[PDB]
Design an enzyme around this catalytic site. Sequence first.
Site, PDB file in Angstrom:
ATOM      1  N   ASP A  35       1.175  -1.781   0.162  1.00  0.00           N
ATOM      2  CA  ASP A  35      -0.012   0.766   0.187  1.00  0.00           C
ATOM      3  C   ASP A  35       1.004   0.987   0.076  1.00  0.00           C
ATOM      4  OD1 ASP A  35      -2.064   2.018   0.258  1.00  0.00           O
ATOM      5  OD2 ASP A  35      -2.468   1.391   2.500  1.00  0.00           O
ATOM      6  N   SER A 199      -0.371  15.336 -11.909  1.00  0.00           N
ATOM      7  CA  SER A 199      -0.712  14.846 -13.311  1.00  0.00           C
ATOM      8  C   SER A 199      -0.434  16.384 -14.324  1.00  0.00           C
ATOM      9  CB  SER A 199      -1.978  14.025 -13.499  1.00  0.00           C
ATOM     10  OG  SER A 199      -1.874  14.044 -14.914  1.00  0.00           O
TER      11      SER A 199
END
Length: 330
Positions: A35, A199
Amino acid sequence: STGSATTTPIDSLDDAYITPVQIGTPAQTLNLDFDTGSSDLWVFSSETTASEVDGQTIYTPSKSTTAKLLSGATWSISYGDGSSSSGDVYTDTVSVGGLTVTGQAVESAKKVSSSFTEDSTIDGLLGLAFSTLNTVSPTQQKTFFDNAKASLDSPVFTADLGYHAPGTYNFGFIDTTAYTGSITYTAVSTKQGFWEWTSTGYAVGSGTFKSTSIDGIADTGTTLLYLPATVVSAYWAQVSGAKSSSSVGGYVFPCSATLPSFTFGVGSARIVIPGDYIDFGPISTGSSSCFGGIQSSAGIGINIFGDVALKAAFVVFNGATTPTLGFASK
């Protein structure tokens, strides 16, 4: 040193991935959920409330000659999906794919929430976010990666998750045969303890690319792609019959519909998520309504590039003094 381990989807939908981890001496092998969105290595154990264990493999520290109680230490964690666990702490030898850390904090669960009990395939989590998120008190503990880092050939790990198939976590090296083209690296902020990056935009199917900054985290422990409501609406508007269902808790669509791809920007580079990766199947057995793999992050407080996005790429988690993230197509 290096390590390399195969990671395997827990079910036919890629709801999560499990990776075998050797703990203690003699080794006890547990299948952990790696994770990159959290920083605790915790396991089902001999100390876990009996009624809360249902099929999982447990760690028994009393059977490990290298286990040592971390005296006074406790831990307690809650996840974005509302699940939780807590307990005490041992140090022990932990190996992943041939890479061994001695003195790793192994957090033994005394209690786990129902979601964990109900998932027989996940024996615990291995956190790979920054150690500043680790919940051990009074002395915060380091992640497996943080402990291994100085010994690794290069201070990196990589995630190469498969679509409906196994993939690979590598530690200490970049497998240049595992991706196509080049790896584009992008800046990381560690201020919230996550692999947080920005992004450069998105496209829906064959549509034109929208240049827009989307801050989010690279999180192998989250199944889906969670993005701003504007972006998500633009995606599902291109799917016949798609709608946001408050009763279901997100966007659903008829399985007869064709899903467009979704492209996200990494610098000037582009990662294309195929439409099939966005199908998470019937909301309930026999239903004609399918659950979408791109959902709104509104009310999470952060955008999450979960497995739907990451499995479309070869991803480098670069733990150099100034951390960065790399993405390649594959």
